[PDB]
Amino acid sequence: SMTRFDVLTVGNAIVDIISRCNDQFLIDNQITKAAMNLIDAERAELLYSRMGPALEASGGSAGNTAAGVANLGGKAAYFGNVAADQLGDIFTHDIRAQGVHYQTKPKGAFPPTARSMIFVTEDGERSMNTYLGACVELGPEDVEADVVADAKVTYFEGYLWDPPRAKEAILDCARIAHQHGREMSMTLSDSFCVDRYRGEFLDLMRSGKVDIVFANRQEALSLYQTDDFEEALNRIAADCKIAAVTMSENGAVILKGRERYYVNAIRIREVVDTTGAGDLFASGFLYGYTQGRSLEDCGKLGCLAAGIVIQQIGPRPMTSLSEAAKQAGLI
Amino acid sequence: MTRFDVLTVGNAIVDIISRCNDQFLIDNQITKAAMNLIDAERAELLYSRMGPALEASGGSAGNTAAGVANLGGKAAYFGNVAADQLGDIFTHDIRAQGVHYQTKPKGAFPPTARSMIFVTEDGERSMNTYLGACVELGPEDVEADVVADAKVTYFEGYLWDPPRAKEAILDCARIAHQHGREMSMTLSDSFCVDRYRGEFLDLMRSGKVDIVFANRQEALSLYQTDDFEEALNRIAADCKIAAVTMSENGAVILKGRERYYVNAIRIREVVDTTGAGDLFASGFLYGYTQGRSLEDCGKLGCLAAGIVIQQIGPRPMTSLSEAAKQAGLI
Ligand SMILES: Nc1ncnc2c1ncn2[C@@H]1O[C@H](CO)[C@@H](O)[C@H]1O
Ligand SMILES: Nc1ncnc2c1ncn2[C@@H]1O[C@H](CO)[C@@H](O)[C@H]1O
Ligand SMILES: Nc1ccn([C@@H]2O[C@H](CO)[C@@H](O)[C@H]2O)c(=O)n1
Ligand SMILES: Nc1ccn([C@@H]2O[C@H](CO)[C@@H](O)[C@H]2O)c(=O)n1
Ligand SMILES: [K+]
Ligand SMILES: [K+]
């Protein structure tokens, strides 16, 4: 039985810089609402100069997912590259403090640690503006082969296709994982990210490099360039062994071959900030999965964690997910 | 026309915030509810034991300046950060709020001050502060035209810990009074008062300070008494105006023989008390520089403080001016 890690995640190591804004701010600054907008250093300086007083919190989609698995009680690890600077030190502290194995060594102080200016509108939607900085350095040299070998599931971001060499690391992970009888998982990350890497993502799924795919409605529609969600569901199920597809307030559906398991979203008092919802859905699902739970229960765990994170500021729940899971009888 | 309503001067700090259980404070010998000074080695040790955290610009006076700006007053700030990422954060947040902030970093070492703030289930906050670049603040950082052009210059008792900051404050007092302005201070923390009791009383009695902010604990510590009534009578004798806060019991404003009692506002829950006194000073000084009555100054203070304790972060993220309009205070 004894495997060192339940879930290894791999992603862009990012610190979030968070501010609430009005709707007009997104229009004036040509920020695509609800999306991840890549920006260069000049634009990062420009947007920051226009941003209100902010809060900082460790982010990165996969980073959040790893933290969420640890909070739930699972054994997690993380690969992601920061710089040797104060933001890097924050990132390192926060993920390690949650009890995630994190050992990726910074390569120097420049480029500096990635940051994402995240603007949260009154509806709770989040629009991210990301300077990748030190994330561009993540490569095959950062694969801790023993960790991939000893993790039940290695999960990675579609976002990793933006930096130049991260994809090589992921192909190395896929090889090591499958050689050791483990599983690979990916998230489609963002609908524009899917627009950029559609062919490569489909090839990952169809070649069997990815066993479990996470998508939201928008990403699924984008993957097949369709407006027909039923078509998207049918096609994604044909392309990967297990698909977990989130539908915001309408919950989730888990697909396996011809099987579909629908799960309801939880009751929200108020949607504060949706940042991290998809990441924490993956935390809940992968925690359940690596505990041998039913696909329906994995979905329920995902929706529980996602529901909690959207009721706070910050992409990583500050409360105990394991305690919430116990109260909810998901255990 | 005066350029600024309120200039504040303080230790420029970024907060690092985590919730902890009661035992964590005992285990780490952290004095609860207090500002605990720490060296670089202890800062690393405590950080190593701290859970996942959130960062937000802090500094008592920095928070007060931000609150005045939020309410709609014209604010400025003197405080020293380093040329590093935390310094960049601090500089951004205070300037983005519309506060004049022009103090120049002197280098990257010491690095920007940070305070690890541990919030217990009761909402109390226990701060652990490595002063870093704050030790460099001195007379060279006094923008004399700013002091000359500010209705009130307000400063922290906390400034007596770093070595040269008191010299800057004495320069401020001279320029302020020469230009007919008023000087204000907060006693900051009861242990800070324990450390600098004599000096603080001398500031008040010499007339270098006109308006004093204290909480109950600081007022008792100032006179080393258990008698709150004695503390009120004595503080009124030592300074022209005293604003004394009593947590959930509101505040009392003293001027000579006059006393104005003000109630705390109704709140949904105490999330994190960090910044309550700072934002009381924000509301009070905003009111004061708008020509409002001392009681209305108190009410504005209790409104701003009541708002800040219902959120994580020592600086209100919501509009204080809108809240003041809604509360019918403006
Ligand atoms: N390009 C990116 N790659 C990975 N994660 C990102 C990117 N941009 C923003 N994020 C993260 O997405 C999280 C929300 O899913 C935020 O915590 C933020 O840090
Ligand atoms: N030594 C200090 N000097 C000034 N401000 C401080 C000190 N220690 C903590 N603080 C600030 O006190 C604020 C709460 O009053 C916090 O935001 C924190 O940054
Ligand atoms: N407005 C929203 C948005 C999201 N969610 C929860 O987060 C998951 C992924 O979006 C969704 O599957 C759902 O669990 C929600 O409950 N309400
Ligand atoms: N538990 C608490 C603590 C503080 N406060 C408000 O903050 C001011 C300074 O403590 C106090 O004067 C008060 O207005 C509060 O309302 N409740
Ligand atoms: K959130
Ligand atoms: K607070």
Q: What is the b/e burial string over B276-298, where b = at least 16 CB atoms within 10 angstroms of the residue's CB? A: bbbbbbbbbbbbbbbebebebbb
Q: Tell me which DSSP letter residue A137 carries.
A: G
Coil, strand or helix: which one is B32? coil
Any atom of ligand 2 within 6 Å of the Cβ of B158: yes
Does ligand 3 come within 6 angstroms of the Cβ of A278?
yes
Q: What share of chain B is helix, strand, coil (3-state, %, to 5)?
A: 45, 20, 35
**Closest partner residue to B54 among A48, A52, A314, by Cβ?**
A314
Instruction: Please report the DSSP string for B246-284 in residue order.
Output: -GGG-EEEEETTEEEEEPPPP-S-----TTHHHHHHHHH
Judging contacts by C-beta atoms under 8 Å, the chain B residues touching residue A54 are: 89, 92-93, 96
- For ligand 3, is residue A281 a contact (CB within 6 Å)? yes
Query: What distance in angstroms lies between residue B275's CA and the mean position of ligand 2's atoms?
Result: 8
Helix (H, G, I), strand (E, B) or coil at B41: helix
Kindly state whether B65 is in contact with chain A, defined as any CB-CB distance less than 8 angstroms.
no
Where is B186: in which H helix or E strand? strand B182-186
Confirm if B159 and B11 have CB atoms less than 8 A apart.
yes
Kindly list the protein residues that place their beta carbon closer than 5 angstroms to ligand 5, a single-atom ion: A 273, 275-276, 309
| Cβ proximity of A298 and A307 under 8 Å | no
| Alpha helix (H) residue ranges in B28-163 | 40-49, 60-71, 85-96, 144-148
Q: For domain B2-330, give the CATH number.
A: 3.40.1190.20
Helices A86-97, A61-72: axis angle to 10 degrees equals 30
Q: What is the resolution of this structure in A?
A: 1.7
Query: How many other CB atoms are found less than 10 A from the CB of residue A259?
Result: 11
The span from the CA of A86 to the CA of B220, in Å, is 40
Exposure of B46 in the CB half-sphere (CA atoms within 13 A): 30
Question: What are the backbone dihedrals phi and psi of residue B76, each rounded to the nearest 5 degrees, phi first?
Answer: -135, 160
CATH architecture of A1-331: 3-Layer(aba) Sandwich (3.40)
Q: What number of residues does chain A have?
A: 331
Q: Confirm or reject: Cβ of B275 under 6 Å from ligand 2.
A: yes
Contact B229, B211 (CB under 8 A): no
- Assess B108–A contact: CB distance below 8 Å, yes or no: no
Report residue A262: phi and psi, to 5°.
Answer: -85, 145
Q: Confirm or reject contact between B310 and chain A (CB < 8 A).
A: no
Ligand 1 atom closest to the CA of A277, numbered from 1:
15
Q: Which segments within A59-122 are labelled E, that is strand?
A: 76-79, 101-102, 114-120
Out of A120, A267, A286, A310, mutate this one to test ligand 3's pocket (max ligand atoms within 8 Å of CB): namely A310
What's the number of CA atoms in the CB half-sphere (13 Å) around residue B199?
17
The answer to the question of whether B245 is labelled as a binding residue is yes
Strands A114-120, A126-131: pairing is antiparallel
**Residue where the block lists tokens 């097949």:** A224
Please, are residues B30 and B118 in contact by the beta-carbon 8 Å criterion? yes
What type of residue sits at position B172?
C
Ligand 4 atom closest to Cα of residue B306: 16
Residue B199: enclosing H or E segment and its boundaries? helix B190-205
Bond before A106 cis per omega within 30 degrees: no
Q: How far is CA A53 from CA A50, A129, A317, B99, in A?
A: 10, 16, 22, 11
Dihedral sign (CA B157, B158, B164, B168): negative
**Residue A16 near residue A162 (C-beta atoms within 8 A):** no
Token pair in block for residue A287: 């925690």
Q: Name the residue ranges covered by the structural domains of chain A.
A: 1-331
CA of A265 to the centre of ligand 3 (A): 6
Hey, are the CB atoms on A93 and B47 less than 8 Å from each other? yes
- Alpha carbon distance A129, A119 (integer Å): 8
Task: Give contacts of B54 with chain A, Cβ < 8 Å.
Answer: 55-57, 313-314
Give A251 Cα–ligand 3 centroid separation in angstroms: 6
Category of B30 on φ-ψ map: left (φ > 0), alpha (ψ -120 to 50) or beta: beta
What DSSP designation does A262 have? Answer: E
End-to-end CA distance of chain A: 21
